[PDB]
Design a protein around this ligand. Structure first.
Ligand SMILES: [Zn+2]
Ligand SMILES: [Zn+2]
Ligand SMILES: [Zn+2]
Ligand SMILES: [Zn+2]
Length: 522
């Protein structure tokens, strides 16, 4: 920059060593800003292009931050711009080790007061031209749930810059990432005085990513310019931009939920012992249901899980159909399942022991459970069948009313409903009531005298003939007949007249022998 000069009147300080008044001028650049001189021994420039050589010391820098024209005369504690300027130049020379305080003799106490203040500030304050840049916090951060999002805390840019901005550059980050400031405003490029926070949708699988903070900072700096060495070096306080980038900042998170399986029967009741296979890619586990019908799994990575019954409870139907359920971040997905009771049937067919093809109706069977309580009764139909729909478990049954004309069956049978829809078919046999008629034929005069050749004929309740038989020897004629009411009469005489009385009898007990005596005449 080309530099330009302007003189003024002042109560100059005197140097005892140099034996002269210490003077200066106001030096101004082409743009208009005020430059200061770095030594009182060489003259200031007039209309010469001066090249940059670097920076002054931080001590000299601190004088310019605190002095004129950064601050005006009233703020600094002096009366005029000339007094403000002169005290600043003197403090610049003292901080640069070109003059010492004890060598100078002041002629203006306002000027002397300000010079002391600016020199004390160069020694005590800590402002520096080294550009400082840091992102807090420095350690890798973990995002935790807050309603709809997983979120970190706030990050902040610590710097000695006067102004600047920065941009967040995430590497391979998840979908739906948002970056916000403290007012909740969505931004990727922010001012250095703003803080930022990371949001991720809660439904994001566990993971991590790296990000970088890139910034453009503006620092004040006391730039030095190189005189010809017959002409002084100068300084100008200027704003200078500077690019900075952080090291990789890591963000990580963990996304899990739970699954609760509730097991029910046909009516809303708790069910123990149901075993389910909970699975997906990366996971498999068989869980069994508890006292309260509940099976639970925690810490499941979020996503779709398959649920499949592998083993049913005691006396319940197995259902191998697959169920699909989503585990979401922070939440317990509930799966409520009903189960069907195992049901089957007993089919009793009632027949005659002598003939398997003869079916017997109206025979009653009673059914008992494991403990022996009566569960149900039922009679055989027109084809000798009795049907009983029953639930799971072990049972017994007995004949409790015999069919008409049969001896009751005394045995106890057993069966079990194991499998669903099973039909157990049983055959029960029955002994028919059969008996004998024995007619001893004697003469009406002589008792204990035989009569062969006497034929008797036996008729049923309706009156139709059944059997004929002559008297064998000793007057005896045997006839084996089934249950029922009958009548009988003499057909053929043994040289005797026929006894034409119509006798009657009933066979009603098995193995029974009915002994009758008929007598003949002439
Ligand atoms: Zn200060
Ligand atoms: Zn003084
Ligand atoms: Zn640490
Ligand atoms: Zn009863």
């Amino acid at each position: 920059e080309v530099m330009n000069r302007e003189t003024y009147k002042m109560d100059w300080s005197y140097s005892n060593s140099k034996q002269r008044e210490i003077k200066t001028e106001i030096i101004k650049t082409a743009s208009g800003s005020i430059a200061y001189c770095l030594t009182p021994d060489l003259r200031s420039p007039n209309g010469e292009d001066l090249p940059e050589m670097g920076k002054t010391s931080d001590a000299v820098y601190r004088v310019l931050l605190n002095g004129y024209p950064q601050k005006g005369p009233s703020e600094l504690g002096v009366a005029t711009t000339e007094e403000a300027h002169y005290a600043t130049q003197l403090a610049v020379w003292i901080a640069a080790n070109e003059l010492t305080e004890e060598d100078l003799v002041a002629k203006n106490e306002r000027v002397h007061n300000l010079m002391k203040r600016l020199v004390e500030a160069s020694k005590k304050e800590t402002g520096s031209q080294d550009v400082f840049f840091k992102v807090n916090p420095v350690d890798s951060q973990t995002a935790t749930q807050n309603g709809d999002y997983l979120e970190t805390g706030f990050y902040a840019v610590q710097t000695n810059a006067v102004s600047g901005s920065y941009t967040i550059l995430p590497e391979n980050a998840p979908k739906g990432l948002r970056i916000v400031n403290e007012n909740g405003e969505e931004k990727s490029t922010l001012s250095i005085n703003e803080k930022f926070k990371i949001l991720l949708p809660k439904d994001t699988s566990s993971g991590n990513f790296k990000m970088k903070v890139k910034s453009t900072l503006t620092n004040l700096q006391a730039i030095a310019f190189k005189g010809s060495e017959k002409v002084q070096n100068t300084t100008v306080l200027l704003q200078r931009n500077s690019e900075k980038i952080s090291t990789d900042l890591v963000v990580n998170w963990e996304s899990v939920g739970s699954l609760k399986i509730m097991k029910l029967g046909e009516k809303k009741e708790v069910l123990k012992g149901a075993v389910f296979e909970v699975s997906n890619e990366n996971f498999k586990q068989n869980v069994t249901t508890s006292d309260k019908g509940i099976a639970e799994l925690g810490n499941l990575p979020i996503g779709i899980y398959s649920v499949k019954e592998i083993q049913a409870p005691a006396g319940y139907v197995l259902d191998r159909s697959v169920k699909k359920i989503e585990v979401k971040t922070g939440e317990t997905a509930v799966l409520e399942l009903k189960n069907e009771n195992v049901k089957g049937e007993l089919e009793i067919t009632k027949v005659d022991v002598a003939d398997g093809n003869t079916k017997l109706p109206n025979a009653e069977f009673t059914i008992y459970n494991e403990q022996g309580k009566e569960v149900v009764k039922g009679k055989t139909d027109e084809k000798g069948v009795a049907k009983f729909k029953l639930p799971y478990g072990k049972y017994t049954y007995k004949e409790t009313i015999a069919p008409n004309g049969y001896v009751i069956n005394e045995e106890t049978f057993a069966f079990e409903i194991k499998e669903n829809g099973e039909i157990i078919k049983h055959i029960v046999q029955d002994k028919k009531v059969e008996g004998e008629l024995e007619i001893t034929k004697v003469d009406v005069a002589d008792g204990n005298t035989k009569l062969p050749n006497a034929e008797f004929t036996i008729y049923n309740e309706q009156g139709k003939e059944v059997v004929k038989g002559k008297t064998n020897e000793q007057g005896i004629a045997k006839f084996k007949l089934p249950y029922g009411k009958y009548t009988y009469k003499e057909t053929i005489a043994p040289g005797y007249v026929i006894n034409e009385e119509k006798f009657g009898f009933e066979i009603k007990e098995n193995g029974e022998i009915i002994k009758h005596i008929v007598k003949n005449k002439k």
